[PDB]
Amino acid sequence: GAHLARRYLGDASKEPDPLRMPTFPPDYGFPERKEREMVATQQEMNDAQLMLQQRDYCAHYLIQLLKCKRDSFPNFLACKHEQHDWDYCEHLDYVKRMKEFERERRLLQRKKRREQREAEMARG
Amino acid sequence: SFPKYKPSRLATLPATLDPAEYDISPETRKAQAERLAIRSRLKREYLLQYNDPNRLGVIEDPALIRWTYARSANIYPNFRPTPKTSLLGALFGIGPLFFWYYVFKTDRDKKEKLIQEGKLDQTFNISY
Amino acid sequence: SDAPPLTLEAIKDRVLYVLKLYDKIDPEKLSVNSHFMKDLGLDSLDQVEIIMAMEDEFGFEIPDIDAEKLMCPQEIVDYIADKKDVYE
Amino acid sequence: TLCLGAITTLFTALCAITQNDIKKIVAFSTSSQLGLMMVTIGINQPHLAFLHICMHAFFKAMLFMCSGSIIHSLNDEQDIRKMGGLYKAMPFTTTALIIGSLALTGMPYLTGFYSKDLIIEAVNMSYTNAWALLMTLIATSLTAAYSTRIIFFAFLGKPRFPPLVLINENNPLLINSIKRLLIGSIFAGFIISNNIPPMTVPNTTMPLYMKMTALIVTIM
Amino acid sequence: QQERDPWYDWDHPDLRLNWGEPIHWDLDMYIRNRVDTSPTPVSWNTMCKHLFGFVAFMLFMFWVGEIYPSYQPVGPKQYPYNDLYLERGGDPTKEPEPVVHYEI
Amino acid sequence: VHIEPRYRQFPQLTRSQLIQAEFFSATMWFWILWRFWHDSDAVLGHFPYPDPSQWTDEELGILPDDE
Amino acid sequence: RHSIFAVTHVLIPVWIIHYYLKYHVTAKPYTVVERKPRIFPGDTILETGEVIPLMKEFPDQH
Amino acid sequence: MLKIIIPTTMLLPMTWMSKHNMIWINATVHSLLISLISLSLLNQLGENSLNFSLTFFSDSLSAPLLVLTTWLLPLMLMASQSHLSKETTTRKKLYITMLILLQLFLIMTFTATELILFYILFEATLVPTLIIITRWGNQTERLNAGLYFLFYTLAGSLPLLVALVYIQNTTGSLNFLIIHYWSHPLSNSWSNIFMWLACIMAFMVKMPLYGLHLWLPKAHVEAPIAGSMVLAAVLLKLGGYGMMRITTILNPLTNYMAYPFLMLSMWGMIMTSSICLRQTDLKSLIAYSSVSHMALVIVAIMIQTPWSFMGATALMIAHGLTSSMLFCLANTNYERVHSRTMILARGLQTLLPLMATWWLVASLTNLALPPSINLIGELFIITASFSWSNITIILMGMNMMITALYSLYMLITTQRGKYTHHINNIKPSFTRENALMALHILPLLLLTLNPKMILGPLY
Amino acid sequence: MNPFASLTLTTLTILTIPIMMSNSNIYKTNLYPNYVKTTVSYAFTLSLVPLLMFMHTGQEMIISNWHWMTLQTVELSLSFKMDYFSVMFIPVALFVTWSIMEFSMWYMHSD
Amino acid sequence: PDSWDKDVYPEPPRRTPAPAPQTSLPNPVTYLTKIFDLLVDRPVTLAREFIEQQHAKNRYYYYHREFRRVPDITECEEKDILCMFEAEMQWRRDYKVDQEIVNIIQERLKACQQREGESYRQNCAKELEQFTQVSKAFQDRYSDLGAHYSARKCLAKQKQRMLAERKAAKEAAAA
Amino acid sequence: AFSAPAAYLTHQQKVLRLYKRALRHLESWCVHRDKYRYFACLMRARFDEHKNEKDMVKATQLLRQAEEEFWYGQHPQPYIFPESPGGTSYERYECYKVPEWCLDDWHPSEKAMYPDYFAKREQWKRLRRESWEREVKQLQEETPPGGPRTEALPPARKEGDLPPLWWHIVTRPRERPM
Numbered sequence A: 001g002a003h004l005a006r007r008y009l010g011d012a013s014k015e016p017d018p019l020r021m022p023t024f025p026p027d028y029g030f031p032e033r034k035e036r037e038m039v040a041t042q043q044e045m046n047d048a049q050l051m052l053q054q055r056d057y058c059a060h061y062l063i064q065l066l067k068c069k070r071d072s073f074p075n076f077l078a079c080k081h082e083q084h085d086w087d088y089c090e091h092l093d094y095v096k097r098m099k100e101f102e103r104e105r106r107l108l109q110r111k112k113r114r115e116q117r118e119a120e121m122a123r124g
Numbered sequence B: 001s002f003p004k005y006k007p008s009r010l011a012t013l014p015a016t017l018d019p020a021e022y023d024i025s026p027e028t029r030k031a032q033a034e035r036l037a038i039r040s041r042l043k044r045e046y047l048l049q050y051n052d053p054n055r056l057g058v059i060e061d062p063a064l065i066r067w068t069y070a071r072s073a074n075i076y077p078n079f080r081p082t083p084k085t086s087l088l089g090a091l092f093g094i095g096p097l098f099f100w101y102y103v104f105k106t107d108r109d110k111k112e113k114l115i116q117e118g119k120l121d122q123t124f125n126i127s128y
Numbered sequence C: 001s002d003a004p005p006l007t008l009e010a011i012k013d014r015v016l017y018v019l020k021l022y023d024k025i026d027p028e029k030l031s032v033n034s035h036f037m038k039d040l041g042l043d044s045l046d047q048v049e050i051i052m053a054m055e056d057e058f059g060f061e062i063p064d065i066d067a068e069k070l071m072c073p074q075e076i077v078d079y080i081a082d083k084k085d086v087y088e
Numbered sequence D: 001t002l003c004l005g006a007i008t009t010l011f012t013a014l015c016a017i018t019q020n021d022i023k024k025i026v027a028f029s030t031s032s033q034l035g036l037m038m039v040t041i042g043i044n045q046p047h048l049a050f051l052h053i054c055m056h057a058f059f060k061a062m063l064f065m066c067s068g069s070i071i072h073s074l075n076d077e078q079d080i081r082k083m084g085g086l087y088k089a090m091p092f093t094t095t096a097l098i099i100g101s102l103a104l105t106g107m108p109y110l111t112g113f114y115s116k117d118l119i120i121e122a123v124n125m126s127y128t129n130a131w132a133l134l135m136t137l138i139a140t141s142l143t144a145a146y147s148t149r150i151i152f153f154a155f156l157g158k159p160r161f162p163p164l165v166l167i168n169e170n171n172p173l174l175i176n177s178i179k180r181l182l183i184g185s186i187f188a189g190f191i192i193s194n195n196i197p198p199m200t201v202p203n204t205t206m207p208l209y210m211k212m213t214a215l216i217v218t219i220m
Numbered sequence E: 001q002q003e004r005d006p007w008y009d010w011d012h013p014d015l016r017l018n019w020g021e022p023i024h025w026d027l028d029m030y031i032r033n034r035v036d037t038s039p040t041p042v043s044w045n046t047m048c049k050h051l052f053g054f055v056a057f058m059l060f061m062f063w064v065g066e067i068y069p070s071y072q073p074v075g076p077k078q079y080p081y082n083d084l085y086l087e088r089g090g091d092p093t094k095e096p097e098p099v100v101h102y103e104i
Numbered sequence F: 001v002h003i004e005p006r007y008r009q010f011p012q013l014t015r016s017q018l019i020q021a022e023f024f025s026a027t028m029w030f031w032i033l034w035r036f037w038h039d040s041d042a043v044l045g046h047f048p049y050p051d052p053s054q055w056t057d058e059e060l061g062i063l064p065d066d067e
Numbered sequence G: 001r002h003s004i005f006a007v008t009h010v011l012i013p014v015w016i017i018h019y020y021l022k023y024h025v026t027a028k029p030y031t032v033v034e035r036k037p038r039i040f041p042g043d044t045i046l047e048t049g050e051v052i053p054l055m056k057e058f059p060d061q062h
Numbered sequence H: 001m002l003k004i005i006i007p008t009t010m011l012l013p014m015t016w017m018s019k020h021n022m023i024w025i026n027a028t029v030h031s032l033l034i035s036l037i038s039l040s041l042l043n044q045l046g047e048n049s050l051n052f053s054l055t056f057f058s059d060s061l062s063a064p065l066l067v068l069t070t071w072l073l074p075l076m077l078m079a080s081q082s083h084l085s086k087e088t089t090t091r092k093k094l095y096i097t098m099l100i101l102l103q104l105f106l107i108m109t110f111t112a113t114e115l116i117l118f119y120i121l122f123e124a125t126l127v128p129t130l131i132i133i134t135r136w137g138n139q140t141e142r143l144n145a146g147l148y149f150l151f152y153t154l155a156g157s158l159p160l161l162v163a164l165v166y167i168q169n170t171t172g173s174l175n176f177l178i179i180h181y182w183s184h185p186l187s188n189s190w191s192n193i194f195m196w197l198a199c200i201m202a203f204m205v206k207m208p209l210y211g212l213h214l215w216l217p218k219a220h221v222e223a224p225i226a227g228s229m230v231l232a233a234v235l236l237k238l239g240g241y242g243m244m245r246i247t248t249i250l251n252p253l254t255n256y257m258a259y260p261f262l263m264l265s266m267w268g269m270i271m272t273s274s275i276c277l278r279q280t281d282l283k284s285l286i287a288y289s290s291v292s293h294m295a296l297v298i299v300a301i302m303i304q305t306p307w308s309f310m311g312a313t314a315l316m317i318a319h320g321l322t323s324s325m326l327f328c329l330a331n332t333n334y335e336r337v338h339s340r341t342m343i344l345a346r347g348l349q350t351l352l353p354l355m356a357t358w359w360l361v362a363s364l365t366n367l368a369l370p371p372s373i374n375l376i377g378e379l380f381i382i383t384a385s386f387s388w389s390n391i392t393i394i395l396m397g398m399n400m401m402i403t404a405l406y407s408l409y410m411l412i413t414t415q416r417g418k419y420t421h422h423i424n425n426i427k428p429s430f431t432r433e434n435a436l437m438a439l440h441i442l443p444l445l446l447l448t449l450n451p452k453m454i455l456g457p458l459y
Numbered sequence I: 001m002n003p004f005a006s007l008t009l010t011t012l013t014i015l016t017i018p019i020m021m022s023n024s025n026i027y028k029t030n031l032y033p034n035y036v037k038t039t040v041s042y043a044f045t046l047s048l049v050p051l052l053m054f055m056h057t058g059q060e061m062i063i064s065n066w067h068w069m070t071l072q073t074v075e076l077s078l079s080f081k082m083d084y085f086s087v088m089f090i091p092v093a094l095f096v097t098w099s100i101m102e103f104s105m106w107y108m109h110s111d
Numbered sequence J: 001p002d003s004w005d006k007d008v009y010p011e012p013p014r015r016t017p018a019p020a021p022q023t024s025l026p027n028p029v030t031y032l033t034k035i036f037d038l039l040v041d042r043p044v045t046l047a048r049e050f051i052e053q054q055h056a057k058n059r060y061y062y063y064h065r066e067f068r069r070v071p072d073i074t075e076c077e078e079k080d081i082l083c084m085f086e087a088e089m090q091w092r093r094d095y096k097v098d099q100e101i102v103n104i105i106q107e108r109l110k111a112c113q114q115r116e117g118e119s120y121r122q123n124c125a126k127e128l129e130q131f132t133q134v135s136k137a138f139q140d141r142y143s144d145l146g147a148h149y150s151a152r153k154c155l156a157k158q159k160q161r162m163l164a165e166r167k168a169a170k171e172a173a174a175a
Numbered sequence K: 001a002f003s004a005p006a007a008y009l010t011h012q013q014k015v016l017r018l019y020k021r022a023l024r025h026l027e028s029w030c031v032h033r034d035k036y037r038y039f040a041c042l043m044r045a046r047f048d049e050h051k052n053e054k055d056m057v058k059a060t061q062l063l064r065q066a067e068e069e070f071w072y073g074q075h076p077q078p079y080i081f082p083e084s085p086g087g088t089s090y091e092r093y094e095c096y097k098v099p100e101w102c103l104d105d106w107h108p109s110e111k112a113m114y115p116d117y118f119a120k121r122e123q124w125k126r127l128r129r130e131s132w133e134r135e136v137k138q139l140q141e142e143t144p145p146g147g148p149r150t151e152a153l154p155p156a157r158k159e160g161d162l163p164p165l166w167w168h169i170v171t172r173p174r175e176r177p178m
């Protein structure tokens, strides 16, 4: 989707732009925002040679999964807990991204409506 | 009644859709008779040497020799300088050369001018 | 291996078989030397249908110019034998 | 690359659904699968494309072998309009071809599933051209369409071949080759998928309707 | 040469020619390994229209889809160490502008 | 193994080919059923897709149209 | 006569190839290059015996 | 280097004193021995050339050409003896004398240290070739062909002589070493422009250049098989060797004087490749193939880069071998059926399978299949031209598409299809023809095994 | 010496033996197709081993064994890459070719 | 091995991890490795021992040819042909040596790209810098000479570059 | 392929050929047998509805309209028998067909095997040599002075003659030579 229909048919001025995002500063609506912490050091990630696209905030679970995959080689059906944990925390990262998108959308629509209302008040 | 089919150069008209073969005259029948007569005479001539036990070699075909000679050696004696011939020769023999010369000269002038200013990204360009 | 080396008697048997299932042809009155137009009283369209049945049965096409000339089952048998190099 | 893959797969899948020569149908299916591979490359998923190559080789070669067996049995006849009821006359060939067609259509837990399903779900969840996505979905429906055409015309109904029945598929070489590729087309997807290290970020969070898109379009 | 009757007993069956008959000036172009002019079920200038319309329509719709892309309602992907500044090309003696990602 | 033509009759079938075909169809269906029984999440999805509309404004942090 | 095929078609070519690679190809630098093996937290290096420490006290989102 | 020159001058009286039935054997065995002797010239240095004496020197560009010539003479002898069986002993000895004189003149041509002696020998090569073409040609057109071969060359070479002597009055020497060490720039003037043209047009007409190539189809079709072999394999490379030797003094004028010749070479490459598609004659197809390849060589020499020079040398060697093999292959069928029309005898694979294999290998090598040296030279030239200008990859690419087409077309026209029904005089191939084809093809792959030896001095 | 390289090279090497034997007294008998089928099957089962090594330790290699020629600054060598793609695709192609050859023996019997 | 100097061709200290089994199942890779060792590596080792034992019985040497330095083209008069010949040969030899240096650096870069795996973009940038420097120097020295190159043309190129640099520096000084 | 063509095609022949083509294309459209039988009987009724048209002009106009309708409604991909000029096995075996005269070029060692076959071949060659002159004489005597008008050849009539121009028809290589 409905977001595509809303942006491409409805009013796109209150619809977030995925390329140009975010347009608001990170501590605008929040009194304080906690800094996201990373568990795996740069050297561990380099030594594991994960990839340039797998070196996100989720790399520790991936390193664990790779280690247990290498350890239990012939039994290729044993690394289910580690895979599940990695997939779960990936899902959490995705949910956080959806949260950021929805926050940006409501920020844009609220700010634009409030600017229009303030201009209307100043016009009368 | 039904949509019509119009022939083209690379998609000709079928025999069953040719109007000329459904309106006939005894003159056309005579012409077909002569055509079959010539074809049968040529076939008999071919088959007489084809079945000869004492024939060893290649049955020379005057038609093939005529085709090759017309395609290769008979062209210049029948060539006349006309406006069409001269214009087509000048076009197809001069236009491509000057067009390609202009293209390559323009590209190389652009390349050289970029080189002089020092902005070409010529790093690692060792082999040339 | 592949299909067996078809013989003359097999060809004649198949021809008479496919002809005996034609509703316009009497089985008893049909012989290997019966003429389609004269002996059996069929028209040209029936001959065309018979030739098409032969093409369907033996799995190869008979050119029209060659097809028109066939008039008796023996002619069809001879044509099929000559086409497939059947000599025994 | 993505646009070229999309147009290729759409056009070849659309052409395949009306063909009567079985070899032509399988060739157009191969071309559509290559277009899908190009689409997968276009969305920045090369390892998925390689896995799809490996997955597709098995059942494509095996489907071609089944078609060749059918052709050889019916005196070198390739038109499906003269291919009658071979469901009972060619049991092993029928079983193999049905399994291969199911694997091609992305039937769950077969060889084609573990690559094509992930390819579709990765295309649905990326910043790509919308027309390419629509063309990919139409192509993956037309895949099932032409597989259904092949099965329906080749194995169901009444005989349409010449009356001299030479059907015989009892040869150890043909049976062994088709059986080997059949076991491959049943288990290689799972075995290979579970035995390679993760080279891709998985798409774990997906809407229920969009996660099932390939199955729905295949069933339609 | 494809237009000629294939059921005739030609002297050269492959070329579909007879001995002694005149040879076309462009025989090597029409050897039926090459340019074919045999009639088609659908008229020329009608196949051209449908084909050109199809290609032009696909090109236009691909461009339209490019200008109206499809995506998911998600924010940008986040990478820890300043969008992996050291990983994507090094340059360890410049102190890039910090890139900070906050919890939500 | 020798099989002769039938000429408008059903072709001769040996027991081995029927056994092989039935066995392989049965094993394919058994594999599909067993894998779906053990790995259903690969088909039906594993993690629930949340609805952005139900997200409270406090956790997303936008001011109540005042400042 | 029984397993002669595996001797003149597998064993001899692999003997020749191993000889050529071990004693001629490897005699020059950078002729055979293998990518460095992966190292994870917790392994022990074979040569120096170094043990790689553990990894930062997982938050344990059980 | 007289150790190679004297054995040919000894081949002469050896042939003239042999018994009436032992001329071919003696000529073949001793030509092969001389080729084995000349194989030693390939031991080249990396800095300077082998300066044997005040008169002869050997570089790494002329050594492969000498080896090719000494190898080609026995092949010409093997090919010639089939159709000269009815000839008298004296005329056979005269034919062998013509071949020996041609080889001797080429050998002294490729190693002359001074430009005027090189010109003298490069012009003396005209007489034996013209005599062979006019005297032992098969059809009435041979006469005219000879004339087209002669004057087309001479009109290009007469100005060069003048230029040469002019240089001697200006710089004081024509020795190549002194000329190279004492090179001075050529200013942009009309006199320098015409000096450039005089020095270049001879080798341009020898290559030949597009527009100046009308003599080549005539000469290569009307000549006997040995004549065709010697024109295609070696005689076309004289222009390239001369251009490489002479372009040392033409800089920096060439930097802008090469434009018309580059355009002619590229567009005529495309044009001749297109011509080869519609050809009713089998020898003219090979002739126009030679024209296209030498146009590529002209481009490589004109752009004047080391990669282009290496590619040009490799392409000349590979083209010589390939064209000689193609001519011999066509001549076998001609000797069988007494006609050069391509569509006369078809389906020859059914009747002559090993000859079909020879045809396939020759055609695959013609269209530059990797990793043959043909493609090595072609790819080096293409890369150098891409460095020269990026748009060239269009024209070159077009050629690389057209060439293969006609090549395979020829094969499909001659070997595939169904045989002609009325031709029943197609005898099984002799051991002589098979040995000729094998001796043509094996050195090609052997050179592919070690390609650094035909890549010229720029290697 | 880490049999990965030797086995990977041997897998490609043993495929050319029937090509070299095509001029012997086996290309003239009726046992040649079986000979080629057996060669392909042996090549497949031999190539199965580097796949196992990669699936265990992720081992990859490049082998530049023969130096063909060198330009001024460009070196051309006979080099092979045995990364994931090669070790994963070679056994699959060998398996498919083995089955195809077996099928061919029966399909092309009358040729 | 010691066949080549390890300073011209350096390598990292080659850290490898010890095996850590976690399953009761046997590992087929080690079993196949043992079989391969016992069936291939030992006969090949014995044959190589025989070959080396035969070689050590007949030992002889070959030497690297040493060239002294002759006056360059700058010490050469306009028409002194002999000194020109010597200087030109020396220049050609130096050109070949420079090409070989660039080749060595390129081999180093390729070795890095293969060895470092997925971290090649960061882990081996030092050799990228080395290749950039050596390629820039080689391009400044020898590029654009074309065919028929010589010591005189290289000297003219160097003089032109020196004049341009001196003019630019003198202009920048006045700024 | 065996019968000599005539100067032109008669109206009956054209109608019969159209009937065959229409029936075959209708079979291509109607895949199933019962549907094909139903529509083929309908087509037969359509064809024999106007069988008794005494005016040839209207018959030819009906034929024209039938050809136009057939061309509009023809199957774009009609069924072709495998060995027909449009089939997938049309000229498959032409690479295996070798003329008999090649056996004249065999080495005597090759001819040592199959001695009886080559004895029979010598018998056939001698028969051809002995009958060629009589064949030529019969063709000369039977031909009209203005040359042949068709491609039909006469049969043998005398005691022991052979039909003229028989060597290259009797000694066809085979349909499945190798």
Ligand SMILES: CCCCCCCCCCCCCCCCC[C@@H](O)O[C@H](CO[C@H](O)CCCCCCCCCCCCCCC)COP(=O)(O)OCC[N+](C)(C)C
Residues within 6 Å of the ligand: H188, H189, H190, H193, H210, H211, H212, H257, H260, H261
């Ligand atoms: C079929 C193929 C045969 C072989 C073809 C070979 C091609 C030969 C052509 C020669 C190429 C260049 C010749 C002349 C060099 C410059 C070209 C000139 O036309 O351009 C301008 C020249 O301006 C005018 O065009 C003057 C020339 C006009 C008279 C020439 C007639 C041109 C008509 C074409 C006739 C075809 C000639 C070939 C006949 C076969 C350049 O301006 P400018 O800087 O001032 O002159 C530079 C020389 N300077 C430095 C001494 C001053």
Ligand SMILES: CCCCCCCC/C=C/CCCCCCCC(=O)OC[C@H](COP(=O)(O)OCCN)OC(=O)CCCCCCC/C=C/CCCCCCCC
Residues within 6 Å of the ligand: D004, E033, E034, E035, E036, H277, H397, H398, H401, H405
């Ligand atoms: C860049 C330079 C080249 C670019 C291509 C430009 C067009 C080239 C035209 C080539 C002309 C060659 C003429 C002689 C070739 C041989 C004769 C010949 O081809 O005969 C046609 C022969 C017979 O036809 P059949 O369908 O097989 O019928 C058989 C049943 N009766 O069929 C063919 O071979 C057709 C070949 C011609 C196709 C050329 C047109 C291709 C154009 C491609 C443009 C699209 C580019 C793709 C871009 C993708 C985006 C990255």
Ligand SMILES: CCCCCCCCCCCC(=O)SCCNC(=O)CCNC(=O)[C@H](O)C(C)(C)COP(=O)(O)O
Residues within 6 Å of the ligand: C043, C044, C045, C046, K011, K012, K015, K016, K022, K025, K026, K029, K046, K047, K048, K050, K051, K052, K053, K059, K062, K063, K066, K069, K070, K071, K073, K074
């Ligand atoms: C699938 C799409 C294509 C199918 C569409 C086909 C449409 C065609 C249907 C209409 C065709 C006609 O009515 S056209 C009807 C043609 N009418 C005549 O010819 C009148 C004179 N009669 C004769 O010549 C003979 O009796 C003859 C009838 C030849 C029988 O020959 P025989 O008795 O000696 O066998």
